[PDB]
């Protein structure tokens, strides 16, 4: 009955734990320049 309600709180915790793990591992793509016109910057 009310067993379920507080267990519905440990949801959004893990939602955010999904979310930060989802996000910043993408953003890792420190030199990316291989030519003269590349290495201008």
């Amino acid at each position: 009955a009310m067993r379920i309600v507080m267990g519905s709180w440990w949801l959004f915790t893990l939602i955010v734990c999904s979310s930060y793990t989802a996000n910043l591992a993408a953003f890792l793509t420190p030199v990316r320049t291989f030519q003269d016109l590349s290495k201008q910057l």
Partner: peptide
């Protein structure tokens, strides 16, 4: 970003307060 943990935790303890306030009052009932 990283201190949302306790922002969920203390609200969960707030959810832990109401059913205890009704349970020990039912023991008083």
């Amino acid at each position: 970003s990283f201190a949302g943990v306790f922002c969920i935790l203390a609200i969960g303890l707030l959810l832990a307060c109401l059913v205890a306030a009704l349970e020990l009052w039912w023991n008083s009932n």
